[PDB]
Structure 1
Amino acid sequence: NPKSDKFKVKRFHHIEFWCGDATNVARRFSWGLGMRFSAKSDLSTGNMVHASYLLTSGDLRFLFTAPYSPSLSAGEIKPTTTASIPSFDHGSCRSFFSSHGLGVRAVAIEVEDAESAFSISVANGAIPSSPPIVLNEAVTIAEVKLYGDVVLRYVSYKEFLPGFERVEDASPLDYGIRRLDHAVGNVPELGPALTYVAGFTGFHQFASGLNSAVLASNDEMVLLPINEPVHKSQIQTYLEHNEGAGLQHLALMSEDIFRTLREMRKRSSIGGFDFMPSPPPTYYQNLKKRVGDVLSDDQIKECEELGILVDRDDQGTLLQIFTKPLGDRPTIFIEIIQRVGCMMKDEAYQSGGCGGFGKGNFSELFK
């Protein structure tokens, strides 16, 4: 609302996971979500440090990284490293997977200048992780701590980061997931988290057992909701298994929630992702009156064929469903979302947060 970003922010760029084996994790996400193998940076391409692989589906970019043996790149230094990412560390990445397990490490958002966004953020209370380093004079990258061991990454451009080999040969799955809608993190105290994060970003606040506040960018396209537990708290269950604060889930905007689900739900037993139980028929019997004008009777019955939730806000309506936890622990999962309405462009598409984020379903599921 106030448009008070301390620097220019374009939109969501990529989301990087820190696995123990980036091959088996990425091969499952490519088959469970339908993403194309775009770029890669492992021992095949000549990277002795980590095995980074890129999955893309529209604008969404999932990066998976697992460190190799430190003895391979033992005779190297920071200015003379082999890793395509200069902010990487073996011991720090091993501690991320030994403590937090499979989780999102870096939430990257493209800015017009990474060195500027870093210098502005640190000068306003941020905690720097890695200073801005220009990658082959083509991409500037900086990282500042978000919550816990999650970092906020700034990327500058003058398809991906240098040092990545494009994979366009026979060695393209697409189910509708186009971009990242929002990224929700869980913190022990929502107070200092909003004071810290929004302190150096200038992000305004967009507007049981949890208290959530959504941070938004200038155009409200970068949405970073933050959650705190309410003391059994389902959010506290996250912090106990994650061993500290971290990301709860990722909202993946789909161009068509109906077919995107029918491409994933038919594959949850062959290596895909599992979903939460479907709401009782009374929810869809009650759904025909709350959003009977947005969704037709033929489209509402299709929501029950896949167990999809619907919420409504101020001139906005969104459809949503949640996957089961991705890793072993009940920590990080994935939300698939499609918003209806709020379309208003001068010359196409809509704004951000069309329909809220589904807080109306917290009571509609309890009937």
Structure 2
Amino acid sequence: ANPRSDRFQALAFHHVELWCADAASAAGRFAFALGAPLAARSDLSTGNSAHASLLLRSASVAFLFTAPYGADAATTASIPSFSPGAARRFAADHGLAVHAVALRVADAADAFRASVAAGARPAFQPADLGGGFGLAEVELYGDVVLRFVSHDAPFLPGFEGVSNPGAVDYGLRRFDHVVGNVPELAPVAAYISGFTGFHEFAEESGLNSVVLANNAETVLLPLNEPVHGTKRRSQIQTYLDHHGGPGVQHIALASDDVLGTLREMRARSAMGGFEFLAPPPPNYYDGVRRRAGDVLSEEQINECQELGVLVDRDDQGVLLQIFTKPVGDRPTFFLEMIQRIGCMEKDESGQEYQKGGCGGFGKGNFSELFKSIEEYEKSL
């Protein structure tokens, strides 16, 4: 029973801005690793002297990589919410980490001011990019910012489109959820739920969890916090140790055939692509046949077996998922490849949709994987 209490029309994820020291290398690696070609650029090739921005896109998922180069007349920046000192500061503290999570908004001025009184500390007050585009940014958590942008039409003013025949598309379709790790969960969760109006979500390894979501449950913002005192310390705390503060832990990418796409992503893992986490032991998939065998026939399960895809269930669907290694240098930011199978409905006027968060987020895999690891460790 979501309240639909969102204080601004948050439609969907617009773009995710990463900040590095060389936006060509990171975007270059993410291009073949994810299978999303270069779609837009704001560099010296476009008259931009302040920063080099490049955008990979695979349908609706749009990664943005922004690095700096300038002076006073460097008003040529496409993004006005950009600072060279902050960009170099960010690249030294966290390596390749997410700086902005941009959402689509009815109007840039409203959602900012709807949050400026709801408790959001401002980061970039609204600005008119010209011709229907407006940009706004609030602080969210840590140094990553929540960005508001409103509207064929280009990505942003100052971005020229990129054409390529390679058309390297690995079937990736949409951003699903953007998870962030913070020291204490309660204050930042009340802060984000307070200034957005977003609600919680209904559907130990060492993580205390909470998931924010909009009315349509399409803009998912899960939050994380560690649990101290464990013999082996939580992966959230070691993140906060190596990230140097709170940040975006991972980002989920939704596909409609994540098996065939993983076959393409793993093909590039040997040549500089995304090396994936070690596949679960064989007896883990003996479980998924008992758990999800009614939804997944063997051939669909066996495609998950070699590729190492994980399987977790809620009542209204099953969630295929697989995690990458830390894509950057430090054990910090990584990527989650998922596909959700279940919970359809033609309730929205007859236009069908899938209720967001279908299948959960794989929280049950902490239990079934650790047990299958111990069950396999005994058999050797």
TM band (smaller chain): over 0.9
User: In structure 2, which of residues 180, 183, 204 is the aligned counterpart of residue 185 of structure 1?
Assistant: 180
Does residue 1:356 correspond to 2:357, yes or no? no
- The verdict on how the C-alpha distance between 1:169 and 1:256 changes in structure 2, with shifts beyond 3 A counting, is closer
**Per-residue CA shift, 1:52-109, capped at 9, x if unaligned?**
00100010001101000x3xxx2327xxx11011111111111111112110000000
SS at match of 2:301: helix
**Per-residue CA shift, 1:272-291, capped at 9, x if unaligned?**
10111111111111111111
Distance 1:185 1:349 in 2: 27
Aligned counterpart, 1:224: 221
User: In structure 1, which of residues 196, 208, 211 is the aligned counterpart of residue 191 of structure 2?
Assistant: 196
SS at match of 1:305: helix
**Per-residue CA shift, 1:20-39, capped at 9, x if unaligned?**
00001101100100112111
Aligned counterpart, 1:299: 300
The letter for the 2-side match of 1:355 is: G
SS at match of 1:66: strand
The letter for the 2-side match of 1:125 is: G
SS at match of 1:365: helix
Kindly indicate whether the alpha-carbon contact (under 8 Å) linking 1:37 and 1:172 is maintained by their aligned counterparts in 2.
no
Taking structure 2 as the reference length, the TM-score comes to 0.93
Deviation at 1:269, TM superposition (A): 1.0
Distance 1:179 1:303 in 2: 20
Distance 1:354 1:245 in 2: 27
Deviation at 1:159, TM superposition (A): 2.9
Kindly indicate whether the alpha-carbon contact (under 8 Å) linking 2:154 and 2:160 is maintained by their aligned counterparts in 1.
no
**Per-residue CA shift, 1:216-258, capped at 9, x if unaligned?**
0011000000000111111100000000000000000011111
SS at match of 1:227: strand
Aligned counterpart, 1:124: 118
Kindly indicate whether the alpha-carbon contact (under 8 Å) linking 2:322 and 2:338 is maintained by their aligned counterparts in 1.
yes
The letter for the 1-side match of 2:315 is: D
Aligned counterpart, 1:259: 260
Unmatched tracts of structure 1, length 5 or more: none
Percent pairwise identity: 63
Distance 1:63 1:359 in 2: 29
Aligned counterpart, 2:163: 168
Deviation at 1:303, TM superposition (A): 1.1
Kindly indicate whether the alpha-carbon contact (under 8 Å) linking 1:143 and 1:153 is maintained by their aligned counterparts in 2.
yes
Distance 1:169 1:145 in 2: 36
Distance 1:136 1:120 in 2: 22
Kindly indicate whether the alpha-carbon contact (under 8 Å) linking 1:138 and 1:162 is maintained by their aligned counterparts in 2.
no
User: In structure 2, which of residues 95, 99, 104 is the aligned counterpart of residue 105 of structure 1?
Assistant: 99
Deviation at 1:206, TM superposition (A): 0.5
SS at match of 1:338: strand
The letter for the 2-side match of 1:113 is: D
Bigger shift: residues 345-354 or 332-341: 345-354
Distance 1:215 1:12 in 2: 14
Taking structure 1 as the reference length, the TM-score comes to 0.96
Aligned counterpart, 1:94: 88
Distance 2:101 2:125 in 1: 16
Kindly indicate whether the alpha-carbon contact (under 8 Å) linking 1:13 and 1:109 is maintained by their aligned counterparts in 2.
yes
Q: CA RMSD in A?
A: 1.2
Kindly indicate whether the alpha-carbon contact (under 8 Å) linking 1:186 and 1:227 is maintained by their aligned counterparts in 2.
yes
Q: Where do 4+ consecutive residues of structure 1 move more than 4 Å? A: none
The letter for the 2-side match of 1:361 is: N
Q: Please show how residues 25-174 of structure 1 align to structure 2 within 5 Å.
A: 25-68=26-69, 70=70, 74-76=71-73, 81-157=75-151, 159-170=154-165, 172-174=167-169
Deviation at 1:169, TM superposition (A): 4.9
Unmatched tracts of structure 2, length 5 or more: 372-380
Bigger shift: residues 161-170 or 52-61: 161-170
